[model samples]
Structures are given as C-alpha cells and as structure tokens.
Target chain A: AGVMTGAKFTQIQFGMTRQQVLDIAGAENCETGGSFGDSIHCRGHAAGDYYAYATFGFTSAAADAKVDSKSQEKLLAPSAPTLTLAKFNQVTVGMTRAQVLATVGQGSCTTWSEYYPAYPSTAGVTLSLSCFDVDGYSSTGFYRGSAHLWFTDGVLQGKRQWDLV
Target chain B: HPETLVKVKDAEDQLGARVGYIELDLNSGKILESFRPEERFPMMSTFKVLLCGAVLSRIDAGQEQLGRRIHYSQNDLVYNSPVTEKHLTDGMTVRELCSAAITMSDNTAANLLLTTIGGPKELTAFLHNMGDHVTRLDRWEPELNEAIPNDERDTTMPAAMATTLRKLLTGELLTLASRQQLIDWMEADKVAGPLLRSALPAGWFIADKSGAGERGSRGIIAALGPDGKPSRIVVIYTTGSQATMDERNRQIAEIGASLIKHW
Candidate 1:
C-alpha cells in the first residue's frame, strides 16, 4: 500500500514524479475533471485529515487542449500530507512502545534510548513511524515547533506539531 | 577571525553546501570576514524581516497602529504556522502578527502583515529608499504555493541582508523603541535564533532569524557582549547539494562554535 506517512511525506520535494507521489500518497480521493491539454488539477486525501492538490500545465500553451502532465506538474498541498495536529496530538504523555507506534502510525525518523545500536555486520535504514516529529530540525519542544515525541523507559513524554519542508 | 575562515570552509565542504557568509564588527562598521558574501540566494522566509521593516516604517510615519485588528479567514491560513493556526478565526493584532512572523516564521502571519503594509511594491519602495537594490520581494506565502517562476521568487544577497540587519539594529532605519522592539522579537525567536546557542558560551545573547526551503537553509545571528551591544554579526547562507539538513545543521553549528571561540 502506498500510504503517505510523515517520513514518506518529507520526500515530496520539488520535481518529483507522478508515480513517486502515487507511491507515497496512493490514489486520489476524487477527480475534479478537465484534462484537455492545458491546465489540470489532481487531488487526494488520507483518513480525511490530510489533502493535496496540484495545478499543472504550461502558461503559454493553448487553451483548447490539455498538455501532457509529465511535461510539468506543480504539486500543492493545503497542509502536511499525512499528519494533522488534531489527531497526532492524540498520542498522549504516557503510552507503551507498541501502543505508540500503533496509535501514531510509522515513520523513518527514529531514536532509541541513551544507548544507540553499536556497529554490527549489517547495513541499516531507519523506518519512520507515523508520529509527527521525525525528519525536520530542532527538538527543543512545541514552543520551537518540533514534531518529536519523546518517550523514556517505554513511557511517552511529549510530541509537538511537526515542522514542514 | 582567521580560525573562522579555516573552520567554516572545512564545514562547508563536509556539508556539501554552497555557502555564502559574512561577519561585521558592528561598532566600527568594518568587514571582519567574508566568503562569497555578495552571492545572492533565495531569501525564503528571510524576506519577512524586510516586510517587518516596511510595517515598522509605516508605524514610525504614523500610518499604522500596533493595536490594529485584522480578522483572517481560513483562506488566509498556510502550512508550517502555529500562530496563524491559532489566530485563523479570531484574527490578530499588528503587534502580535509581527512578533509571530519573525519568531515563528509564521507564513500566515507574514502574509497578513504583507497585506497590511500594502503588499510587495511598498516593500520594494522601502528598499529603494535605503538604496538596497540587491534584495527583491515579489510573492507572499501559501498563496505562492504553486510553481513560482524563478525570477519572481523572493531573493537576497548575504551582504545585503547584513546591511539591512545592521540598519534595523542601529537607529539608522527606525526609532530606538521600534528598533528595540524588533531586536526583542529576534532575540525571543527561540526557534531559529538558537542556532548559535549551545555552540557559543552559556548565557550569551543572540538576536537573529532563520529561513528554510526545499533545497537549503539560511540564518543571521548577532551575539552581544557585556555592554549589550552586538559584539559579532554572522550571516550564514547554505545551498544544499547532496546533503541532508542534519549534516547542514552540523556544519552551521561548527561554524558558530568557531566564531564563538575566536571572539
């Protein structure tokens, strides 16, 4: 399933492919119509909390027919694609390790305790949980706009509104 | 100063960034150190400060009020803003909006202030008066979410940013009270201003702002000495090139530590 999560959401930089977006965000919620060689709009939503839309086409192109979208696409989202403050904050100050991931979802940005995993004969890649504060900058707190959720001794501590790209 | 050049360049290479940096000894108006300092980069949200200038300039001229109330709609909202998210319905005052714009890099607050200050043209005029032709302000946030052509995007050179910042910190462009107000806002910006916090000695005061974009990050920091005046002004602008933001941040911190040690 191409589900959009906080970690996948960060990869939605400029000049990404349609399939790339589809791999991250999955299918659109609805088709708003019109693709006749000029301007086109694409939209999608996940769990009704996040939404995205894009207006694409050449400015100088003809009005009668639609242009190929792969030629150019300008993706725009009204808010963060996979996370919302209303729901993400549902992650409380105290929760279990499994419960935290289950409640918040999955993301690539992860941190484990005071002891980091030392070197082993293996390659590693971080998988982010759906929690808000994984892949931006600054972890001071909500006042500084960090989305990081702090958990110690398997007890949840805090999570703030996540930063954007 | 010499240590700064050596360490900054090393960090620049390690981070794979195209760095444009400059520092000034504010009291004597001397160019302490620089590298590609005149190179211009996309200003991102840093342009918000100039907008702040336009607003304060108007306030100085008796054209706007700090208590002026502005009611914003859902359409006025933007992503990446905690202040606007809260103020979307009830709206906010001119003073609150300015504070939020700088301290939080709140796009919604910045856009609201831009509209209040008569949009980009007035800000352009404000720059012209200062003879600061290097910076350009063209678009407003969330509204400019679509594909903004390169030429129309907000941009500024590091030297120009330092020049404008100097004017704001001193009384050259604003009344003393207004200057202090702006400085207070910058100092209170715990979010971006802390770029030099732990790197510098403990309890050192830094007043600055920072901006981030898809490709890079940029920030300006001024550290104050015992007299409560800026002892050092540092502007660090980085363009991403195959580097993660975490790496870029490390480089910035290293640069900050170097500057702090030199001072």
Candidate 2:
C-alpha cells in the first residue's frame, strides 16, 4: 500500500523538510546513512507496468533536514518491446515496411510524402518517406543512445544507429 | 536615411552581439537594407541549403536521381541528425535526404549530401562556378559550427549568402523544377520559428533556413515578401557575443521587425 509512484515523487519537492517527505513517502520505504551522506534513498515502488524511485539530498543530516536537491527515474517493465542492435541489423534493405516493423517492433514513427505532377495529364510520381524509432527499453525506460529506420516507397532503404551496443 | 540599420544597431547594442544582415530585392537585384552586410559569420546549418542546391544541380544534369537511395551504416551518423540518425538500416532517396537536410537541418543528412556532391571543396567550387567566390564550406558539420571568434572556415558574409541564395533559388544556377523543389524544402523548414519568421507581420510569406553554433553564432537565409510570393531575399548572421541564444534570437527578430517597418 505505501508506494512511491511518480505522483508521490512529484509530491516531494525541493526545500521540503525530511519529515515532510517521510510523511508522503512513508519512512519505512526510505533508508538513510549510506553512500548518500546527507540524503535519503527511497526504493522504487512498482506502479502498474513501471516503477518510480527518488533521491532527496538535504542541506544537512539533522533531525529536520530541508531538501536541497532531488531526482527521480521511471523504469519500464521487463516485458516491454525493446529494439536491440541485432534486431535492427536484421532489418535489411528491400524488406517490406510490414516485415521491418515485425522485426524491430513498433515504437514511434513519422511519414512524409510529396507528389510531382507531369504536364499534359500524365500519371505523376509520388515519393514517400517514413522513419521509425529503434527503441531500447531498460531501467531508464529508454536508451540514452538510439537508432532509426528509414523506409522509402514502402520498402526499407537504410538505417542510422548511434551508441546502441 | 537607412532607418532599418539604426534598429539593427540598437538591437545589437542591447543584445551585446555583432549583427550582420542584408535585404535584397529579389526581382530588381537591389540592396534594400543592410548592416555589416559584407562581414563574415559562421554559416552553420544555413550551408545545408547550398549543399542541397549542388545536389539538385547534379540531379538536373541527369547525373543523379531523386529516387536513388543512398545507404550508410552506423558510422555515417553525425550530431543533430534528427531524421537521418533515425533510419540506420534503410537508406533514404536523394529527394528525402534533401528534405531532411533542409527542412529539419539534419547534420548527417547534410554530410551525406555533401559527400554525394564530392566534399566541402567541391561545394566551394560549385559556388565559385556560380560567380560566388566569397562563401566557402571548409569542414563537415559539428566542426563547421565551431564558430571560433576570428576563424573564417565555413563562414560567409551576409551579402554573399544572400546573393548566392538569390542565384540558387531564382537565378539560372538550377533548372526550374529543381529550383522549385529546393524552395519547397526551405519553405518546409522546422527551425525558422523563433527567428525572422517570428518577427514578420502576420500573413507575410517566408522560405528560409537558419543556423546556430558556438560564440552565440546564429544566421538565416530567406526569401520573404507579402502575400504568398517571395519578393525580397534577406540573410542575417550574428557572432562575437556571449549572450544567450534567446537574446541573440530576439536581436535577429528585432532586425526582422525593422525590415518590415522600413519596407
């Protein structure tokens, strides 16, 4: 019942007294006197598919320490769809957009299209472009570094990856 | 009696930055207003417009195809490539690459297009052939945006940039179709917001590419006018300031306001 949801984390703002944080985040859920000399490290509370954790650094480790700084991290569940470098590499050129999507799993995407008309009533050519995010879900919910897949005319054309090992 | 100059000067003083700008009549080829117009500043993403222009020239000559897909690996990705950095496995066509380079100011897209047209030297050569010997692209992105106080590498005068933009967009440097496509890409730019476009009178049209870098360097190359058709070309650049980007952008917006008031 007493858990640190992202909502509860937001309730613990900077400058709040340590007692005030304990009031909202339940004293039993936090620990003191560790590597964090003048701070309280609260264990992540599982809220549905994700978990939320926070660290409240105080001005002093006194009985009434006022929060000096704070930070929070929201982590995703283990079962979330993740796009790894190996999976991204499996998405080769000329593969249909549907096939690529099945390989990498969907995250977020944007589509762009332009039509070039020919004179005298001839059939015009339409160019299409789509970019899909290569998402990696972990404790941080997503990777610090990411990659993307580009599809032109409904087929995979190329991809760009960065810092995704 | 250049009132716009005074507004730009006041803005520069207020913002504590060097402001260089030029407004040319696109139809008449006359300098409408200017300040430090010949002074150099880092081109930054503004060079992507010209980079795409060279690629369009190659396309116009039947040497390149808009539908031709260009492939690159993870090693090709560069900083600030919002579009190209996303698509690592599937390469993009020339048209899509140009759009990404210009509309989104994707650094990797610009570098790929640069490599397609040879390199920085080849782009400089293309400018020279178009009778513009002043604007030069010396390095790739990230390095090109270093914006060192006195370094002229990858820098261009406001006047030179405006002139080259005019030639590429409206002159004979590119075929009519290629020219229109390039303008369309500039017209779709996502980075113009907070710059000159933000200062223009409501309903005034603008097709522009903007750039930003170190030393508070920022710039814009644009064709702006009343109604839907662009009648004047405006190029503005700033450097040598320790001011925040917001302050520099405000100065440039003030310059745009002055141009509108004078016109």
Candidate 3:
C-alpha cells in the first residue's frame, strides 16, 4: 500500500504529459504509481540502455515462439527463472478471509506486529502496517494500481496506493 | 443473460484462471436473478468499497469520530511513504486514515479500520445486511492469494458491483453525505480511472472503487456513470489473470477505454 488517497491525476490523462510519461517509466529507475513509461525497472532490466533494449527485443520475439518461451524447457535458452506471482482464481470483493490465508500457505516467521522508528525503538516510532498479505510474504492488494480503502466504525478509512518504488 | 459475463469468462479461460465470473441484479429485494459469482477466488481490496457504508453507519450512529486520531505503525508500510519511514508512529486523524486507505492503500489504515469496525465477521454481517453477501474477510492481508484454493469459495458467483455502486451513488442505502463521501473517494482514487470510473460520460459525476490483487490478480470496476445520459453505470471484475502486471493492466485499460468509447 503506497497511497490510499486516490489521485485521479487530474493533472494527467491517457494522452499524458511528457513529465507524466517520464514519471510512469520511473525516473532513473524510480517507480511512480500507474502504468506510463517506467520501462527501466522491467524484469531483465538493469544498468545501461543495452539491457533495456535487449529485454524489449526479447519481448518482441513473442511472434516467434520457436526461439522464445514456447520452446521446451530443455530447448530454451538457459537463464534464471522469472517467477511471477499474481492473483489466482477470481479475486474479487466479498472473498473469504479463510481463502485469503489458504492462498499464501500458513504464515511465515514474521508476523508484522509492533514497530520502532529508529531501529532501537526511539522517538520516531511509526505504528503503521505496510499492507496485509493473504500470506504476508508477498504483496498483492493496494500494492500498485488503485487506491486501497478500509473501514473504521463503518466509514471508509486508511485509503492508500503507492507508485514510486 | 449478460453478454459481458460470457466474454469475461472467455477471457478467464484464455488467461488460465482457476475461477472467475460476473453477478448483478441479485437480491433486488425480490429475486428475479441472483449472482454469487465465483471462481474459487477471494475478494481483494474491493472490500474497501463497502467501507463507505460501514464507516458512514458508524458516523450516523455517533460511536466514532471521523476526525479522531489513529497512529501509524510499521504495518502502515503498505501505503505509508517509504521516505517517511523515519517518522515515529505519530497519529493521523481518522479522516487522514480514510484518505490514506483510499489513496495510499496503507495497511495500517486498513488494520485500524478493521479493528475499529469489529473485524471481518462484523464487516461481513454488515455487508450481508446491506445485501453485499459475497464472502468473509480473514485479515489485513492484501496479497490475498498466491496459489490455487484447495476449497471452493462460498459464492461461486461474483456480485454485480454496479448494483452495489448504484446503491451508494443513489443514496438509496446511505445518507446523502455518506453517498457523496463514497463518490468523492472513487473520483479521488489515485490509480487508473478507465475501469470503474469510466462507465459514465466525461462530464457526468461518479464515485466508486477499483480492486486488484496478485496470485493472478483480480479487480472490480464499480462506479456511477449515470443513466438516461450517455453514461452507463457498470461494474466489471476480472481475476486469476495470467497476464504480466503491465500487460494485464493495459488490457484492463483497453477494455474500459473501449467501453467508454461505445458508451
């Protein structure tokens, strides 16, 4: 959850401004919220324009699966795995909390409860939850796209959604 | 009966979804058609949309103060700015919490609200009473699902979020102020607008929420696009997508933009 205060980007639209597009691609590897131009942080992206161009070239190779992902695992080029964990089934409203947990296995060693602002638990203490996890190990809702909302005493609360990463 | 539902299901098939669907015009207090749309998936942040009614209900009951302060915690990392991590767990007013929840998607804000609202059971009951019986919320977890479900979801059906959104926009279920608040939150959403917010004409006003999650990723599009006008109120949800984050999102935008164009 990066930001909950929904921003229509009343400043930006589909045909965005140059700055907005730059921000979308993430400035110098900085990720701003929303899909725009942040191509620098893509999967195989690293330092240098060469890497960027190479990744795009690989993506473009989808037209010829004989040399791409469609090849048998043994026949494909050797490289590290790009494990992408995304939503499964029909993630939607009114989904069960039980199912939420079941999706991520049990729980991990870290049960993020409590906080300390300065490492030693000094004055700069923040008691906020970054976000929830059906599994907590991975991130999903309110992580990217839209502003996430929550409830308190019946009214919507804790609006957040983050972009810059 | 819905042509949209069929297409969505087809999209799910193409994406290799374990479950998916569409539901609307259910429990209209009369029962002509009911949708408990399901695809063995859990509801993600779409749950936030219900916050409007519940939060306003509390305000209406006088048990809570919208402006009250609730401190931020590391849990808030979900939405709290990483740059502000050095700050202590200072307090933020309830209003700010809601704003954070709506904008930043702070988990701390969600936890505070979840705790304040009496947990998922309470939320589920409240929503059910209001006729939003979809499923139960387990915790503050946002990732939701990372794998297939061993058990099928309660409602193998999805809700026509459009109806829920319509109920809010019309002030049929909430007070005028609360209705406005929900709409404002939707309009204020910092994420994409083409999905839930695009059902209506550009000039028409709207308020609604969008939902998305990993594992495959699921989203709900609900908003007041208006009626008898060029705007058409609609709620569309997609989940268990196989598309990459960028591709999946672009696809969503494509659908919404196309809908808006025809609308």
Tell me each candidate's RMSD, in Å, in order. 19.5, 17.7, 15.3
Which candidate has the top score in TM-score?
2
Could you give candidate 3's per-residue lDDT for residues B117-197 as a string of tens digits?
Answer: 887668777767767665555556443332235433321134434445556556457778777776676666654454444
Query: What TM-score does structure 1 among the candidates reach?
Result: 0.61
- Judge the docking of candidate 3 as incorrect, acceptable, medium or high: incorrect
Rounded to one decimal, what is candidate 2's iRMSD? Answer: 16.7
How far in Å is the alpha carbon of B174 misplaced in model 3? 2.2
Which 10 successive residues of model 1 chain A have the least lDDT summed?
Answer: A69-78
In candidate 2, stretches whose alpha carbon ends up further than 4 angstroms from where it belongs are: A1-165
Best candidate per lDDT, number?
A: 2
Per-residue lDDT tens digits of candidate 3, residues A1-165? Answer: 122111211122222333442344334433322311121112122111011111010112122211110000001111221111332222233334344334322231121112222332234322211222232222221233222223222222333433312
Against the hidden reference, what TM-scores do the models get?
A: 0.61, 0.63, 0.55
Candidate no. 2 TM-score = 0.63
Give the per-residue lDDT of model 1 (tens digit) for B88-153: 335788988888878767777888898987887778778878778877777677433222224435
Q: Name the Cα RMSD for model 3.
A: 15.3
Q: Give the residue spans of candidate 1 off by over 4 A.
A: A1-165, B142-152, B221-223, B226-228
The C-alpha lDDT values of all candidates are 0.57, 0.71, 0.41
Candidates ranked by DockQ: 3, 2, 1
